[PDB]
């Protein structure tokens, strides 16, 4: 769809060059420079949301969503795998 | 998709009984106990991470999106904005 | 001083009946018990500060610190570790 | 105590100049920047429990003390306060 996209591109930069790209430069610097930002975002998610800043919400909770797939991409992961665990759930 | 069911049937239950369902129950109770939630799911996606306990993690990720969309269901928002978000920056 | 009878009774039941009190059910619950609340007790602490609830804000804060220190607990370390680490820094 | 000469120095550069110092610069910045901090340094901690790096969480748990002290200062309070709450809870 979107994050199939993204899914893939995070996976085809996984083991790429540092400098390359940011989610590049992530993968190389490790699982805790990514969890660094998951923290971070969803902390802003609790601002903005506090806030009524409706529009970096958005723009927060997309970073969040974001971080988190290159996250299931650095464990080999991907998002499809939290869709169905979504559709598991509800319906 | 499967995400847009969801948020529709979120926002259905927007203003239903306290006790009709989880859901439900959430947004009686205020902003800040969603945002306790996601939290919560954001903290346990780091501990589901750390322990490379990859089930956990896709479970945690996707209750962090779940309640994600919890959040943006009580701002007015829904989940194709996130998505839409997430278009307009890779891609 | 104040902390530190905190510290020690927190060692004291360290080990204790895991009905025998709140802070020897978490230890026996274990490390990701203990790491939840103080995730919880750091988003409520942001929480308050955005609604300048300035008394909940305090109570938070020392939620924070009380769980840090039952976590430094059971890592076999004690307060005065912090104190001094703060010390040693600032001034 | 330890705290009180920290809290103090806190108060003392609350208002001074942004490049004065890092504690000066926070506060210029806003409570946004300062929260930022306390939830990056509640991640740490996390992370640095389960790595089982007992330095380093004590390091952070510190830096997330004192960070909450800056958060404190920012609004007219201080560690007294948490300290004094923490007393009138266990004992």
Redesign the interface.
């Known amino acids: 769809?979107?994050?199939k996209?993204?899914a893939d591109?995070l996976e085809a930069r996984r083991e790429a060059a540092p400098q390359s790209s940011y989610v590049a430069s992530l993968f190389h610097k490790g699982?805790?420079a990514?969890?660094?930002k998951?923290?971070?975002e969803?902390?802003?998610?609790?601002?903005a949301?506090?806030?009524?800043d409706?529009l970096h919400?958005?723009?927060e909770?997309?970073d969040?969503?974001?971080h988190?797939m290159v996250?299931?991409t650095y464990?080999?992961?991907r998002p499809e795998?939290?869709?169905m665990?979504?559709?598991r759930?509800?319906?």
């Not at 969803?42 to 601002?47: G, K, P, W």
């Not at 949301?49 to 009524?52: G, L, N, Y």
Request: glycine share 4%.
């Open positions: 769809d979107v994050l996209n993204i591109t699982e805790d990514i969890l660094k998951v923290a971070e969803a902390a802003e998610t609790l601002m949301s506090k806030d009524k409706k919400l958005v723009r909770v997309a969040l969503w974001f988190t996250l299931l464990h080999g992961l795998d939290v869709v665990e979504l559709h759930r509800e319906g």
